[PDB]
Symmetry: D2
Subunit: 303 residues, 4 copies
């Protein structure tokens, strides 16, 4: 898949970030993974982000990532596969090239590690990672890596395979400046945790799709919220927000990291053997898991 | 008017916040203010907020506020006038009652002073202020006073004259939860500094309308954006954003307080003797004034 | 006093900020105020801050402040009396003068209202307030009013009655640069909530003394800790922190504003008729007063 | 050495973190590195941190870190050598064992990568890295990894080789609580960028010592500030703060990352070809380098 093709796919529907499955011993569980990814397939997300932040990228050994990408590819079907990438330039470049080789259709470039960095250095970092590969690249504003509109424009002019922008800052004023400035030069992806809480405002800002972490365990509900979004059916979105997403928010807000941990708890409750999180996330308590199962309720997958 | 009549007016169009005029001596300049306000009401803003944030409420003596509202109300015409309010509860009540008595159509309750507060404290504070008058109150989320949805719904049950919510947090997750929760129990006002930057997303979040600071000096342009916004002209909105508002933000971001100071400089440049800002704001340098002057350009009054 | 006289008094002992008593309705209750203050006077604090933050300045009418100040210095004795001041420039001077005409030995200029301001603006504001009175002024670094050292040096060189510096920021780097730059031109008062947690560090940073809020209800403990701190008794300071202060911090951290609320719950526990906090503060629940009571323990005032 | 010995060396003087030298192509430059480190040895810092934050740990490939630790070990003499370590648990463990293997005297565990994490997770992550090696371990509070006192207590009880605590928060309230609770169970290192700005308050808060980035290029000056601090020569410290540290601070605050870039520039100015920083740091401008060279003034090691 060339950069323009992954670009088109990014704009053709809802985006899903599968959790990464671990056995009791914390090693990658490829059979469980594929099973979950085969099931998600039936709901026809156009792009699958393998080993994103929902997939606990920040806890993966670098040589684990190609293995997880290839597992997804086996059962993904006609779904474009994008791989997480990140860390400093030297590691990111080696990851990017490792997943290109196993057939990734693009990379999602998560922040570099630890330091706050001037816009100059950001530009220099991302330019080299983009130049390391021929596949499509999506950048990702969050935490210690926040590209300004001017800087992003420079990267776009100089790196044709840079085709997408994921936002995790919540900075409405900045992301509207970015879509105004760049136009159709980039596909714009909402990437806040529980992005449905943000989807309608982001529409207005120029974002017509987002990553839906909850699609991991209630894809039917996520597909419905998305269809309601694109059709302008505001009473339907509002109902789904009050009935499911705000109550999910309250479970998520009980501890740091639960934007990943509550999602993986939901996978397990729906009968997929996703297993535990790697430290330093912690898994939900039994009580908390009980509150989640009750919320899933009518959307339970088995008994 | 009654709370429901201001509620309706509040959602009926673009809202404006006139700067407060001062003179050499430093006192409020009433006739100047009156000739500025009168010029604005001719651009058909349904509601005017006298002595709000942009009207430097934070730098106003309690006694001054009813004179400014009086001045505004004199030449407001068909436009309704909502008055700034604020500080701690005791002063807030005292201020509320003074402006009701000179016929304020409503109250915009700015946050209390200095301290952080629990939700149950904000409840008691806002409740006490609402109940001391009969006119409509709009609460204002920003800084040290941020109402959660459940606390807000609690106030709305308790005080029927609380009819509006103004955001200045830019917390787009929170404000969508507030509109989803309350529904039409409230009117929702975009109140970010230079809110045109947030207007398209605020509407997606379900906001009734927003307030335009820059309307103070380029009301024609503010009206143009607002109409293109309501009629879906995304490309026209984009042009005005790119050519005017983002260059304005580059001037505003040069220093703290310029959300007010640059607006005020805009007013003077168009021939209204608005005077300086009061400490601890500072006025634009002569360079910055010229930048803003250059940016106004074609719109020069 | 003259400015140099309150300057001198400010540096010669442990200072504190008496809570303002309200009746249950409730306005200022000067009877209960005076008896509470008189009991504190016997604990020999040399400077007394009437209507400061701990005394809910932020919730007082500008009329109530001279009344509170006069109520204070009636029973204060030879103890010096400093008044709160604050809000915008215009209100601030009015309050400044108000309390000077009822005998205040100086003023603590609390931050201006709401907005963020330029250094130059902070300069013009504080300069005008200093030149409105003849009594001594101490500035207060906190929230939206944070003076840098170059700015502070300019105010010192323009307003001779500006003689004290209270920090509420906890910014170590900044206050060490301030004491380095100004030398003995200013008296430096540590002003964090529960400043005892910070006292051992602020000495090293060059700070003359600090404010003890808990002096309100356990002034024996505050004098025991302050004495050890000055004598270089680390093991004794360390005991009282492990035993009292970090437990008191756990309660104080239960809710916003409890840096005053928990202190006023402590005063009422020792039989002083302080009454409620004014909104938007709230009072501790019964359970939390229970918690506090158990902690006060042996230091409980008795007949 | 064993954990108690490194604990002792950690408490015995001023500590420093050498920049990592790179050639123009960004590769590790070991010739220049050992040359610079041999110079830092003459000034007798009792502990040397190779590939710490000042040494651009966050930009090193994991396989580079053992090579760097080995180079510094060649010319360090009797100075203890501690290795940077970090990222999430799996990577951190591999690095930890790799540097134990080339003979490091301990590790400094930088924060895990990207995410805010609950105290229980930090416990689990740090406990697993400690248990992976036999050498001394120092924890490092900063940014997305901030241990509470109660959490650090349990790690201390569970992991004997955990012997040190470096602070990067500047949270004086919290670090006082931490020394009050742990006592001499741990040695305490001040670790703010330009820690001399903080040294006097931190000793007060009971910190065993601190680490001086600027020792990289004016170790004479850093040494004298340190002796003055320990002797209570307050006027001496204050003179050096006003004449050098606040001026350096003003250079350092002109851009993000210059807490490391400004130090590397200073090393270059002193005639050690430390080379450029790796992106996303950027190097000082020629102009800014000019300001740094004039500030260094009388403390120049060379004439150009
Ligand atoms: C981006 C999407 C954010 C959702 C989450 O972190 O759970 C990503 O996962 O990389
Ligand atoms: C609220 C924000 C209004 C900005 C505007 O004038 O549009 C306030 O200034 O009080
Ligand atoms: C810790 C010391 C901080 C100084 C700096 O980052 O320059 C470290 O370098 O690991
Ligand atoms: C000063 C701050 C004292 C706080 C404390 O010691 O807890 C003030 O209230 O103005």
């Amino acid at each position: 898949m060339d950069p323009e093709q992954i670009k088109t796919a990014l704009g053709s529907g809802l985006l899903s970030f599968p959790v990464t499955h671990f056995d009791a011993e914390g090693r990658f569980a490829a059979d469980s993974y594929r099973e979950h990814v085969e099931w998600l397939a039936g709901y026809k997300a156009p792009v699958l982000f393998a080993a994103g932040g929902t997939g606990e990228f920040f806890s993966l050994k670098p040589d684990e990532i190609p293995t997880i990408v290839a597992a997804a590819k086996e059962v993904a079907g006609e779904t474009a596969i994008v791989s997480g990438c990140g860390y400093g330039t030297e590691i990111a470049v080696d990851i990017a090239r490792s997943v290109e080789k196993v057939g990734a259709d693009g990379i999602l470039l998560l922040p570099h590690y630890l330091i706050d960095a001037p816009q100059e250095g950001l530009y220099a970092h991302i330019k080299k990672v983009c130049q390391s590969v021929g596949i499509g690249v999506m950048v990702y504003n969050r935490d210690n890596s926040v590209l300004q509109a001017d800087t992003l424009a420079r990267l776009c002019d100089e790196c044709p395979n840079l085709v997408g922008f994921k936002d995790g800052t919540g900075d409405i004023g900045l992301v509207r400046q970015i879509t105004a400035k760049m136009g159709d030069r980039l596909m714009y992806l909402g990437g806040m945790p529980t992005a449905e809480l943000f989807a309608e405002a982001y529409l207005g800002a120029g974002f017509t799709t987002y990553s839906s972490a909850v699609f991991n365990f209630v894809p039917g509900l996520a597909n419905e919220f998305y269809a309601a979004l694109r059709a302008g059916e505001r009473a339907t979105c509002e109902r789904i927000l009050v009935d499911f997403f705000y109550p999910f928010m309250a479970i998520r807000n009980r501890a740091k990291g639960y934007a990943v941990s509550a999602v993986k708890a939901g996978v397990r409750l729906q009968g997929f053997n996703a297993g535990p999180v790697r430290a330093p996330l912690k898994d939900l308590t039994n009580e908390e898991i009980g509150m989640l199962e009750a919320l899933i309720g009518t959307h339970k997958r088995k008994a």
